[model samples]
Target: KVFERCELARTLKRLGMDGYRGISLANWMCLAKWESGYNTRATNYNAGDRSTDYGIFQINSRYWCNDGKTPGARNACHLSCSALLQDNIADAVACAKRVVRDPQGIRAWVAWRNRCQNRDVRQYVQGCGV
Candidate 1:
């Protein structure tokens, strides 16, 4: 599912991701924009690493999720990578929460590291009323 920015912001706020649950909502918004453009079915394959990133948060089969078809899949989140492709987003958020709890924190996402790191992301949610 593709979402409007404000719609996604409100939803993320309700999910307690508005800079409260884990990463700030602003940062989350930026990362979502760069990672999937707020589309739930987004997928990116890394041929160099033979890994695939799934869904909005780009959970990777290399460690966070399992595609089953991928060899030596880590599945640290204990969920199918396909689950992240759903429109609901609940499962994706839950898995993302687990990833955030890891030592890497939000830095596990290269998109966040490069795009959102050390920046004031509050502007992303500026008029969302979140």
Candidate 2:
């Protein structure tokens, strides 16, 4: 499923994550854009390491979600990787909150680190008013 910018912002806000710990809605907006292009079905199979990233936040198959075929999956979210591919985003949001609570916080996202770290992303949510 795909989100139309502000739709996701509203949803994230309703989930109490818009300005979480000083991370602005614009930052999350940038994170999702770089990670999945707002497509919930998005997945990235890294050719270099064969690790897969799932959903809007691109949760890694290495430790977050299980791809079933991947061996020794921790399945820390206690749900299949497929759970994150739906439009509802309930399970995905729940799992993502847990991920953010981990020691790395938002650093779990490579996209965030590479593209959003130390950057002001207010433009990403310019028209969203979120």
Candidate 3:
């Protein structure tokens, strides 16, 4: 609740993406529940074929990390990649908001049924407690 609602709200407001301009509480909540179940430090370190997908929101290390070539880099936490897992909820929400800033509105999520279909205050968001 804190991460999706308060933290997101504050972050969006700071960046000029508010209530209707940026992602709403409901939308954030839905994605958060689906992604990490609100577990910031949640990880999946498979070693067979899949390489590195780390941090909350599971950002691929290859894109955001400077040390993407190093193995121990996967474990390090920072603003760009590990913001979600870090203590700053606002940082995490900001990270997520920026990632999904395309299309200029919630309509950007239209193709994703799991979240786009239910953008209002619904049970689906609350049922998946963080």
Best by lDDT: 1
C-alpha TM-score for every candidate: 0.93, 0.89, 0.53
Residues 1-130, model 1: lDDT tens digits: 9989999999877887765446788888998898999999999899878899999888889898888767777888899898999998888988988888878888989989899999888788999997
What is the lDDT, from 0 to 100, of the residue 87 in candidate 3?
46
lDDT of 2 by residue, 23-68 (tens): 6778888888899999999988877666788898888877888887
**Global CA lDDT of candidate 2, please?**
0.83
Off by over 4 Å in 1: 20-22
User: What is the clash count of model 3?
Assistant: 0
Q: List the residue pairs that clash in candidate 1.
A: 19-24, 19-25
Which portions of model 3 show Cα errors greater than 4 Å? 1-20, 46-51, 65-67, 70-80, 104-121, 124-130
lDDT to native, each model: 0.86, 0.83, 0.48
Identify the candidate with maximal TM-score. Answer: 1
- Count of backbone clashes for each model? 2, 0, 0
Q: Against the true structure, candidate 3 has what lDDT?
A: 0.48
Q: Give the TM-score of candidate 1.
A: 0.93
